[PDB]
Amino acid sequence: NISVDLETNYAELVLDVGRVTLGENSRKKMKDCKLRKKQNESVSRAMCALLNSGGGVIKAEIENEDYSYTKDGIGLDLENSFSNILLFVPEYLDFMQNGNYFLIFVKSWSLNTSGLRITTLSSNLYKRDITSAKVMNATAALEFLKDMKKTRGRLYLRPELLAKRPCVDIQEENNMKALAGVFFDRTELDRKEKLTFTESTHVEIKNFSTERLLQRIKEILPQYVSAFANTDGGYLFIGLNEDKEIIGFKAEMSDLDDLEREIEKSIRKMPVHHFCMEKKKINYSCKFLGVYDKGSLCGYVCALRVERFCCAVFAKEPDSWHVKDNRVMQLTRKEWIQFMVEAEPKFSSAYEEVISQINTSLPAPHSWPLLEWQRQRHHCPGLSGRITYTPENLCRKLFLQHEGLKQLICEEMSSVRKGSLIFSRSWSVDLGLQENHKVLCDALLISQDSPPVLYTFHMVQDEEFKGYSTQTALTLKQKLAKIGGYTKKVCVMTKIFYLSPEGMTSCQYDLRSQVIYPESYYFTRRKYLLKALFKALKRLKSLRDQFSFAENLYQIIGIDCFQKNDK
Amino acid sequence: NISVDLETNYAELVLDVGRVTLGENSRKKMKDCKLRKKQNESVSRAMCALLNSGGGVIKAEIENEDYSYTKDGIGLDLENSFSNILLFVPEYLDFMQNGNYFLIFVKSWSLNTSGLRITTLSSNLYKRDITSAKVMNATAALEFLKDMKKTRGRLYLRPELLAKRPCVDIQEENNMKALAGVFFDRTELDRKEKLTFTESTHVEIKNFSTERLLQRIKEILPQYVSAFANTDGGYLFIGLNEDKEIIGFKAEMSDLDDLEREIEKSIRKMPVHHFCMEKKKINYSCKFLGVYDKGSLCGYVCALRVERFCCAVFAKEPDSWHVKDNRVMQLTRKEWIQFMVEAEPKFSSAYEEVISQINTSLPAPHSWPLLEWQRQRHHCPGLSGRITYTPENLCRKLFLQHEGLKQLICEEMSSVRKGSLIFSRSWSVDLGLQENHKVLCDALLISQDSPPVLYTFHMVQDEEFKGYSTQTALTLKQKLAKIGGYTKKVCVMTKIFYLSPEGMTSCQYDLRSQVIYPESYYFTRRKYLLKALFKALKRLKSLRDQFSFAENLYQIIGIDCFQKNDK
Amino acid sequence: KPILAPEPLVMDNLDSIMEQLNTWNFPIFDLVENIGRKCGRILSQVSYRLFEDMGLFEAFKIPIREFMNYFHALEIGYRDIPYHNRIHATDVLHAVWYLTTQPIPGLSTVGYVFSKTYNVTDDKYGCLSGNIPALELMALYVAAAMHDYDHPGRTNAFLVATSAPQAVLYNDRSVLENHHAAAAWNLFMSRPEYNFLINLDHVEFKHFRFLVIEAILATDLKKHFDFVAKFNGKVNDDVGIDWTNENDRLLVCQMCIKLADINGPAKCKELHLQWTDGIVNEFYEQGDEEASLGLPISPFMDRSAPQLANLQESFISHIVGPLCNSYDSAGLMPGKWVEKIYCQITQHLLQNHKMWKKVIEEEQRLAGIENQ
Amino acid sequence: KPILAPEPLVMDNLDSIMEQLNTWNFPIFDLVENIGRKCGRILSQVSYRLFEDMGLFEAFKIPIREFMNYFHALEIGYRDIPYHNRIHATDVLHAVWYLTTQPIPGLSTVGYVFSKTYNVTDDKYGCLSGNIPALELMALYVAAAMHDYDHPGRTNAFLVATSAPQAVLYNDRSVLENHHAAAAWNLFMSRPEYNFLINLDHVEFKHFRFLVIEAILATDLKKHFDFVAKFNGKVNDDVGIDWTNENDRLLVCQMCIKLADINGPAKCKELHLQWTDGIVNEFYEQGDEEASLGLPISPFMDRSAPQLANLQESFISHIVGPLCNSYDSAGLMPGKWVEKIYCQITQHLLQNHKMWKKVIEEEQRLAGIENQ
Ligand SMILES: O=c1c2cnccc2cc2n1CCc1c-2[nH]c2ccccc12
Ligand SMILES: O=c1c2cnccc2cc2n1CCc1c-2[nH]c2ccccc12
Ligand SMILES: [Mg+2]
Ligand SMILES: [Mg+2]
Ligand SMILES: [Mg+2]
Ligand SMILES: [Mg+2]
Ligand SMILES: [Zn+2]
Ligand SMILES: [Zn+2]
């Protein structure tokens, strides 16, 4: 199975997928196709789960003894799965071999032009093409479900009238459907007789010259039933050959009953989701016809008819995963359809609209950004005005007492071209998490280079707070990417300090010199990070004093507040 | 080639694709793969062209002597192409065999959740997956182009600094890129030596043990160049084998020059589209290395490096077609990218917004629709109030004189449960077309059943006006589907009458008893048709008096006008 | 000097009719004949009864003396014209009190205040007095009381056309509604004995004033389609009416008063006919004064060539129709289940429209016959 | 009885300065010292000169006598306060005349009317007088002239807080702007000799009145972020400014006057300092009158503890900054090519902001040192 890796010093979700062969030649040469497919589906489950829930990292132990990745690649089934889930691969993945492990750093799935909100390995909604039953991909299923939800059901044009047309010898699909219909009501079949119709969008024919015929039906029937129930219904005949000569399967009575019961259970186990007022079920009808040769019964032929449905009909639950708390779980049908159908929520008042569209940055300076403004322009004496100590009332309070703290912050922000650190009594509570009282304060430095750090200060020379800082950095990463709408690669580093009674040193932990990331995780943008932080704090209902933009001017002008969306 | 069929009595675009085999067994058994592929691409061009420009009908002559379509199907390559272009097939296509022809009725491509505005057989924008160069599908190309257009270019993080990381033996794709880079600057190759890197998102290796090697390069190189130029650039080495042992191709000097020149032309013929201020070109560099075995030259190896680009790079022009006037033509690169990138335009003032959202029709009556209102509620004495003679000032004028006209209209609207016919001096001018003065008036009856008719009246016992009426019905169909935003299957029938000096009869033409359509083209909706007519007239700048909704009440209340969008 | 009140506060002879005040077809004119029609005390009495029903005299600790003082000054202020008079204000007040304190099938109730009995034990009917705080409801009631105050008897377009002083004073942007709100609040703040909001906080009073002005300005028919389209785009594509978000509650009160204002063609045929007589008489008066100036006589305002049926049918089809459909698609029209749900208001509306379309067809056909 | 005009229409002694009137740093106070400062005739003279420059006296056939009559009555009407006086109106008029009749690199010119010389032969510079009809431009000029008329010397928030009569008359919704538009148009319509629009049609006059009221109401700073966001959403995601669609031209004139109103921190340092002195003196007066009533003294309006640099820096950063960035991203700020394009206005704005941030840092550091 797949389990979260709780003993890694990464500030991220680290899924452990077990042992996995790698290299293209060795994935090919692997003399066990079943284990190969199992490994592939495991890695793909992990990747989908990390895409649906913030970021992450997939950790797999290199199974074969000799691997390099600079002369072996990854594989060709793994690459196929990766490219199937993601549109553009190098925008979402980064591969890194670290000794005896192969790591895959997964960005978070971001809303794009397609309109998708999650990623699914397979929707399991089958649609009926002209002759073949194919599974709907992401955009097909999206449009299908949105269309069905728009009309609170699915429209039909039930036989109120046949169109008064001219007289002419015309041939259409309705001919094949009607011929198959008269076939369905036929009472006995001459063995080795020819058919007058072929397979179309309402007619599928299957040979199945198998001795068992129970497992094959139980495993293939739901996809054809879901194909028919999603486009116009139709008939399924089992017992013909590829030349339409009636042959039937050689089965005897007392088997027909168990086979019919198996068909019944295999259809009643198929999921379904109604957008309509009432809640019907999959209306169909089984039937068994004899294939009398001369006066004897050469076998039987199974005829099955499925009617058009009012709403969706899955062949299985949708393959969509996410890591809820730990022990990565599959999305439920209600949650999956909720992610697919329901819109994205947003208000975007005009004040916040301008505070966001201050981020144009066309080929020109475009000065005056409203998110990095601060009234007290004088902290940390030896320096210029380039570090906005944001809260301006928590920072001054915290710097008045705790004498070592101001000198520590000055030592820390010396090598920063331009940034803005944001204090707090506890970031864990601001991010909706359990608090611990031993921590003095926190901070969040967001500079041009140097991905965002999370300083955790405290005065207790007994504990470590590594768990606290890592959980907080993890949740901040996930909140940024998911709620804040940051659409690039982020990693929240960490640092822990110890402020004793006149001791302003002893950094007890520096996460940057403990973990190695890919090359692109180190160059953030510092303006979209600020917008993401704004939006995440707003959606979390904890945007209070950060991002000052003082209102002594507004209160004079008369402009109102800008947040706490209940007024 | 493909040519519009000007001698058909359909009120539609009828493309003629020539002779085409049909039936699955005969398309399979056809002993000529080249002709089969040619026929398939021809039908697909026709289908894309009809999808991009209103509706249409594809007409192909059945090539094989014996075809039924009720026992032969269509094929399996044709179905593959159809399903590739369209998401849901039975929503857009209808097949009909009429004697010695096979007709395909194609709905018009309608804006859906995907955001696409046209359909393309192949974008020809290649992207580089982890190891393979694949062509972008519709949604991939859509997101790619929209992203590039948003930033007026394509962002990079040019080597200003390498990220200060810890010290550890880590392996990544940058290793393979750097090794291939040092390979590119190498001066001589030992024949039969091993490589230390494999192929990745920056490195592709090709064997090509061909005697010619010119045609193969000229036909395969542009897709790899477009793959590299669209994601991070990279190197292409030609002259290795599948085991990375350097072999090279056995070519001699005075061939290397012609081969380099062919590479140069094959790269300079590749299209490109810039969203940036300046207009660079595809920066690369060819180079040829010797493969010295012991002291002799065992051949050569061609190394090619492509740099990352600022904007799109096509391998060919995009496969997107449309029928402009006649002689169906391929979309140009500017027009294609304009359809893909630029938004849909719409204003939707609040008055028109309510006049449209009067079409809710939830499970309840929801009376008071504002589009079928009329002040003069008394025409055509023996009847109830169920046919809104819309203009109300052109209709009364036309009925005062032309004595036979009122009795004709009464005879005609007798068998109509509920409709609304809309007169005009000439619908051809209202739809932006050349007028002819011999026609008295026109009309447009839009009932529940009975798809919309186009009555053309005139008093000249010499001419026919079949061309006029068919052109007008054709353009009305296309305008409805494209501009009006009608998202179902429509067909504008026709009728021509003769109003002599006291002769109110002699219907000289009745298009319904001349052409046969599929079964679903006969049941329109009569409310979305009215909304579509409203929007089409508005966008055409000819919405004057149709859809009365009298304003003696508004002028009292004070509400303004509702159209002529320049105020 | 100021208008204080009648000597007895609440009169007793107008009983047995105020108790049948929870019916949509309230016999308002029988009450006008019941109360002394000389002075005019209908609005003050109806307001006292409705507030005492809602218990708002306790939930906000209001003195009844100054309450009656203010509302009597108000009802004295209403000009004595044929339609926009104190009877119209009382009708709108009763309609709002009905729409906000009666069972609404398919509702989800959540310092609120409910009506007198309301017999609320089930979980099938909610009332809007449970989804809307008491302050906002009192604001809606007071706004409905003073919403046509000091009406001149003309339309916005008339005052704008002749460039009346009151139309230049407001720059031709909601002339009448701004005038009503301003004059009513001015009269309120004028005296110290009209102050019946003495036990309100400062922020309470500011929010109350804001909501009252918003409700009054929302009844301008030039904003009709904007309000209707906004309500459509909030219960069609959104989650619906979030009863927590205050802008949603504000929009709900605005639409509630928009529909309680024009409710003539949603009552029985007799009340509807009387209101129609009033409105058309006022239109005729305006047409007289507008022909006296040499202006072209406006449509429907010609007492020599009336088109009353055309006016009322066009009105019911274009204004009251879509408004009721929008207010009902959000599931707010008060009704009952049937053994599926019977809405009396939409029924009355449809019946009145069908009557007018009978009269239209009959007159049209007869004219077409005679004219030949 | 009515204020007619001075005896000579156009004075001659104020020459050689009106010709240097096409410079963004116009020496306005030197002109005030040039014209007789006792009576006050700056606005009327500047208006005559600008209209004669644009030739609008011919394109609309306006009599100069009644023109001077009306504008002299206007300039007499402007209260004599430290900031919102006739000099401010003249400054806004000149700023609008500059922004709409000067070359704008990267424009596409299409009964229009251009400025006096404009030396227009090239295809690189357009002026807004070529994309905007003459009627709308005259409407913008007249609206800028009468936009702070009869200013009481307070803010909207002050009149709303103390519940002034003029704040109840307008229901606390753009009190000052509605008052200005109403009083100006009332004074215009008062006499028959002020009527300088005698040669306009009826629909012409109605559209002119509409545009003038719109421009005047657009200068309310409570609508600042709405206007800025609307202009952003029309030149960022749309095709841009369609010079055919009339709502686009209306939005352009509204933003042009919004920026011409607050243009102190976009001129040279001396003019900016003088305007700042004026505005802060008016704030101090309001603070005196607001402490006299017992209200808490508002921010920045305390003549005992001024925070002038804080006020001006916050203003330049929050209001004038984003407005200039929006007005420039649409490519409408007038500038010139350099051998890439040099915009004097944004330069002045940046320099003034840097000066204020010097003063802020210096005072802040000194206070931090002394306070210890
Ligand atoms: O037919 C009715 C009616 C019928 N029963 C009751 C109330 C009614 C109110 C009105 N009308 C139509 C005219 C009108 C009404 N209110 C206005 C407000 C402004 C301008 C025009 C109008
Ligand atoms: O600093 C300046 C300034 C500086 N130079 C020129 C003009 C200026 C105008 C203003 N302010 C800031 C305060 C303020 C101004 N106009 C208002 C309108 C309403 C409310 C507050 C204000
Ligand atoms: Mg009113
Ligand atoms: Mg009213
Ligand atoms: Mg002002
Ligand atoms: Mg001003
Ligand atoms: Zn269903
Ligand atoms: Zn480019």
DSSP B244-267: --B--B---TTTHHHHHHHHHHHH
Q: Cβ neighbours of residue C7 under 8 Å, at least 6 residues apart? A: none
For residue C1, is it within any domain?
Answer: no
Paired with A240 in beta bridges are A246
C-alpha of residue A439 to centroid of ligand 3, in Å:
62
Question: Which residues of chain B have a CB within 8 Å of the CB of C225?
Answer: 350-351, 353-354, 559
Task: Please name the residue ranges forming H helices in A185-289.
Answer: 214-230, 256-268
Instruction: Report the SS3 class of residue A497.
Output: coil
Domain match, A144 and A288 both: yes
Instruction: Report the SS3 class of residue D353.
Output: helix
B204 is catalytic: yes
Instruction: Provide the domain limits for residue C36.
Output: 28-371
Q: Please identify which residue in the block is written with the tokens 């509570």.
A: A429
Whether the CB-CB separation of C77 and C183 falls below 8 Å is answered with yes
Q: Please identify which residue in the block is written with the tokens 């703290």.
A: A405
Q: Please identify which residue in the block is written with the tokens 């009917």.
A: C125
Instruction: Measure CA C70 to chain center.
Output: 19
Cα–Cα distances in angstroms (integers) from residue D229 to residues A354, A357, C230, D100, D320, in the given order: 6, 8, 20, 22, 14
Cα–Cα distances in angstroms (integers) from residue B186 to residues B288, B304, C254, C320, C363, in the given order: 10, 13, 79, 84, 100
Give the tokens for residue A183.
């076939």
Instruction: Measure CA A224 to chain center.
Output: 27
Catalytic site residue from B12, B41, B91, B199: B199
Give the tokens for residue C177.
């509604």
Q: Cβ neighbours of residue D368 under 8 Å, at least 6 residues apart? A: A378
Q: Breaks in chain C at C–N > 2.5 Å: after which residues?
A: 110, 339
User: Which residue from A24, A98, A171 is facing B69, i.e. has the nearest CB?
Assistant: A171
Backbone angles phi, psi at C62, to 5 degrees: -105, 135
Which CATH number characterizes residue D361's domain? 1.10.1300.10
d(CA C120, CA C103): 9
Domain match, B482 and B516 both: yes
Whether the CB-CB separation of B502 and B403 falls below 8 Å is answered with yes
Instruction: Tell me the one-letter amino acid at B8.
Output: T
The sheet with strand A56-62 has its strands ordered as A3-4, A14-20, A56-62, A101-106, A93-98, B170-171
Strands of A8-156 (E only): list them. Answer: 14-20, 56-62, 93-98, 101-106, 126-128, 133-135
D157–A552 C-beta distance less than 8 A: no
Give the tokens for residue B104.
């395909």
User: Which residue from A79, A89, A232 is facing B90, i.e. has the nearest CB?
Assistant: A232
d(CA A124, CA A143): 15
Q: Please identify which residue in the block is written with the tokens 């009828």.
A: B14
For residue C11, is it within any domain?
Answer: no
Whether the CB-CB separation of A349 and A562 falls below 8 Å is answered with yes
The CB-side HSE value for C348 (13 A sphere, CA atoms) comes to 19
B342 is catalytic: no
**Does residue C237 belong to the interface with chain A, where contact is any CB pair within 8 Å?**
yes
**Neighbour count for residue B493 (Cβ, 10 Å):** 23
The CB-side HSE value for D63 (13 A sphere, CA atoms) comes to 12
Paired with B509 in beta bridges are B496
For residue A35, is it within any domain?
Answer: yes
d(CA D291, CA B171): 72
d(CA C222, CA C150): 20
d(CA B105, CA B519): 11
d(CA D372, CA D360): 18
Instruction: Measure CA A236 to chain center.
Output: 35
Instruction: Measure CA D294 to chain center.
Output: 34
d(CA A406, CA A389): 11
Determine which helix (DSSP H) or strand (DSSP E) holds D337, and give its type and residue range.
strand D336-337
d(CA D150, CA D166): 12
Instruction: Tell me the one-letter amino acid at B210.
Output: T
Cα–Cα distances in angstroms (integers) from residue B340 to residues A116, A266, B317, B514, C127, in the given order: 19, 44, 14, 39, 50
User: Which residue from A24, A172, A244 is facing B96, i.e. has the nearest CB?
Assistant: A172
Rg (CA), chain A: 32
Domain match, B80 and B191 both: no
Domain match, A498 and A360 both: yes
Whether the CB-CB separation of B425 and B394 falls below 8 Å is answered with yes
Q: At what angle do helices D86-100 and D246-261 cross, to 10 degrees?
A: 130
d(CA A200, CA A242): 14
Domain match, B193 and B310 both: yes
d(CA A366, CA A361): 6
d(CA D180, CA D186): 10
Exposure letters C141-180 (e unless 16+ CB within 10 A, then b): bbbbbbbbbbbbbbbbbbbbbeeeeebbbbbbbbbbbbbb
Give the tokens for residue C328.
């009902």
Following CA atoms A124, A127, A130, A132 in sequence, which dihedral angle do they give, to the nearest 10 degrees?
20
d(CA A338, CA A322): 15
Cα–Cα distances in angstroms (integers) from residue D213 to residues A338, D89, D207, D216, in the given order: 49, 16, 10, 5
**Does residue C242 belong to the interface with chain A, where contact is any CB pair within 8 Å?**
no
What is the phi-psi region of residue B152: left when phi exceeds 0, alpha when psi lies from -120 to 50, beta otherwise? Answer: left
Question: Which residues of chain D have a CB within 8 Å of the CB of A358?
Answer: 322, 325
* Torsion sign over Cα A151, A152, A153, A155: negative
Whether the CB-CB separation of D86 and D314 falls below 8 Å is answered with no
d(CA D192, CA D198): 10
Cα–Cα distances in angstroms (integers) from residue A186 to residues A239, A288, D258, in the given order: 15, 10, 83
* Resolution as reported, in Å: 3.2
Which residue among A294, A317, A340 closes a domain? Answer: A317
d(CA A286, CA D154): 86
d(CA A272, CA A309): 10
Q: Cβ neighbours of residue A345 under 8 Å, at least 6 residues apart? A: none
Backbone angles phi, psi at B64, to 5 degrees: -65, 150
Among A367, A372, A377, A380, the residue to mutate for chain D (most D Cβ within 10 A): A367
d(CA D348, CA A45): 59
For residue D5, is it within any domain?
Answer: no
Closest CA to A79 of A90, A65, A63: A90
Whether the CB-CB separation of B238 and B287 falls below 8 Å is answered with no
d(CA D371, CA D363): 12
Whether the CB-CB separation of C115 and C53 falls below 8 Å is answered with yes
Closest CA to B197 of B211, B208, B185, B183: B183
* Torsion sign over Cα A156, A162, A163, A169: positive
Domain match, A360 and A424 both: yes
d(CA A460, CA B289): 66
Distance from CA of A153 to the nearest CA of C (A): 16
Which CATH number characterizes residue B208's domain? 3.30.950
Determine which helix (DSSP H) or strand (DSSP E) holds B284, and give its type and residue range.
strand B284-290
Whether the CB-CB separation of A246 and A301 falls below 8 Å is answered with yes
Domain match, A83 and A137 both: no
C-alpha of residue C261 to centroid of ligand 3, in Å:
9
Domain match, B440 and B397 both: yes
Number of domains forming the structure of chain D: 1
For residue A428, is it within any domain?
Answer: yes
Whether the CB-CB separation of D310 and D302 falls below 8 Å is answered with no
Q: Cβ neighbours of residue D205 under 8 Å, at least 6 residues apart? A: D197
Number of domains forming the structure of chain A: 3
Nearest CA in chain A to B98: A170
Instruction: Tell me the one-letter amino acid at D158.
Output: F
Whether the CB-CB separation of A423 and A394 falls below 8 Å is answered with yes
For residue B115, is it within any domain?
Answer: no
Instruction: Tell me the one-letter amino acid at A229.
Output: A
Q: Cβ neighbours of residue B473 under 8 Å, at least 6 residues apart? A: B11, B454, B492, B493, B494, B511
Question: Which residues of chain A have a CB within 8 Å of the CB of D224?
Answer: 557, 559
Give the tokens for residue B555.
């002028």
Give the tokens for residue C45.
């009495």
Whether the CB-CB separation of B489 and B520 falls below 8 Å is answered with yes
- Tell me, what DSSP letter sits at residue B513? G
Domain match, A99 and A130 both: no
For residue A64, is it within any domain?
Answer: yes
d(CA A541, CA A535): 10
Whether the CB-CB separation of B453 and B494 falls below 8 Å is answered with yes
* Torsion sign over Cα A213, A218, A219, A220: positive
For residue C7, is it within any domain?
Answer: no
- Tell me, what DSSP letter sits at residue C346? H
Instruction: Report the SS3 class of residue D198.
Output: coil
d(CA B374, CA B391): 9
Give the tokens for residue A424.
């707090």
Whether the CB-CB separation of A222 and A267 falls below 8 Å is answered with yes
d(CA A83, CA B223): 18
Instruction: Tell me the one-letter amino acid at B326.
Output: N
d(CA C347, CA C342): 8
Whether the CB-CB separation of C49 and C18 falls below 8 Å is answered with yes
For residue C81, is it within any domain?
Answer: yes
**Does residue B83 belong to the interface with chain A, where contact is any CB pair within 8 Å?**
yes
d(CA B403, CA B411): 13
Closest CA to B456 of B507, B491, B420, B415: B507
d(CA B424, CA B403): 17
Instruction: Report the SS3 class of residue A458.
Output: strand
| Pairing mode of beta strands B455-458, B439-442 | antiparallel
Cα–Cα distances in angstroms (integers) from residue C244 to residues A563, B331, C124, in the given order: 15, 52, 20
Cβ–ligand 1 contact at C265 (below 6 Å): yes
Cβ–ligand 1 contact at B556 (below 6 Å): yes
Which CATH number characterizes residue B40's domain? 3.30.110
Catalytic site residue from A41, A172, A173, A199: A199
Instruction: Tell me the one-letter amino acid at A171.
Output: Q
Closest CA to A259 of A323, A202, A304: A304
d(CA A10, CA A491): 9
Domain match, B226 and B276 both: yes
In chain C, % helix, strand, coil (3-state, to 5) comes to: 60, 0, 40
Distance from CA of D111 to the nearest CA of C (A): 27
Cα–Cα distances in angstroms (integers) from residue B41 to residues B35, B317, B347, in the given order: 10, 16, 39
d(CA A519, CA B373): 67
Exposure letters B502-538 (e unless 16+ CB within 10 A, then b): eebeeebbebbeebbbbeebbbbbbbbbbbbbbbbbb
Instruction: Tell me the one-letter amino acid at A477.
Output: K
Nearest CA in chain C to D172: C210
Instruction: Report the SS3 class of residue A472.
Output: helix
d(CA C18, CA C30): 11
Cβ–ligand 1 contact at C276 (below 6 Å): yes
**Neighbour count for residue C66 (Cβ, 10 Å):** 19
Whether the CB-CB separation of A309 and A282 falls below 8 Å is answered with yes
What's the length of chain B? 567
Question: Which residues of chain A have a CB within 8 Å of the CB of C245?
Answer: 565-566
d(CA B145, CA B125): 10
Instruction: Provide the domain limits for residue A257.
Output: 126-155+175-317
Question: Which residues of chain C have a CB within 8 Å of the CB of D164?
Answer: none
d(CA D281, CA D272): 14
Whether the CB-CB separation of A139 and B139 falls below 8 Å is answered with yes
Give the tokens for residue C89.
């204000």
Q: What is the 3-state secondary structure (H, E, C) of A470-494?
A: HHHHHHHHHHHHHHHCCCCCCCCCC
Instruction: Report the SS3 class of residue B440.
Output: strand
For residue A327, is it within any domain?
Answer: no
Give the tokens for residue D114.
């251009």
Instruction: Report the SS3 class of residue B541.
Output: coil
C-alpha of residue C345 to centroid of ligand 1, in Å:
17
d(CA D292, CA A40): 80
Instruction: Measure CA B512 to chain center.
Output: 29
For residue C247, is it within any domain?
Answer: yes
A343–C244 C-beta distance less than 8 A: no
Paired with B57 in beta bridges are B14, B105
Protein residue closest via CA to atom 21 of ligand 1? B557
Domain match, B539 and B434 both: yes
d(CA B522, CA B542): 28
Protein residue closest via CA to atom 9 of ligand 2? D262
d(CA C261, CA C76): 20
Q: What is the 3-state secondary structure (H, E, C) of D228-264?
A: HHHHHHHHCCCCCCCCCCHHHHHHHHHHHHHHHHCCH
Closest CA to A48 of A107, A119, A112, A102: A119
- Tell me, what DSSP letter sits at residue B485? -
d(CA D279, CA D312): 10
C-alpha of residue A463 to centroid of ligand 4, in Å:
71
Transcribe B322-366 into DSSP letters: E-SSSS-EEPPHHHHHHHHHS-------HHHHHHHHT----SS--
| Pairing mode of beta strands B509-510, B495-496 | antiparallel
| Furthest C-alpha separation in chain D | 72
For residue B377, is it within any domain?
Answer: yes
Give the tokens for residue B353.
């917004």
Closest CA to B238 of B226, B250, B254: B250
**Does residue A155 belong to the interface with chain B, where contact is any CB pair within 8 Å?**
no
What's the length of chain C? 372
Whether the CB-CB separation of D266 and D354 falls below 8 Å is answered with no
d(CA A40, CA B263): 39
C237–A566 C-beta distance less than 8 A: no
For residue C23, is it within any domain?
Answer: no
Give the tokens for residue B416.
């109509």
For residue B161, is it within any domain?
Answer: no
Domain match, A490 and A372 both: yes
For residue A325, is it within any domain?
Answer: no
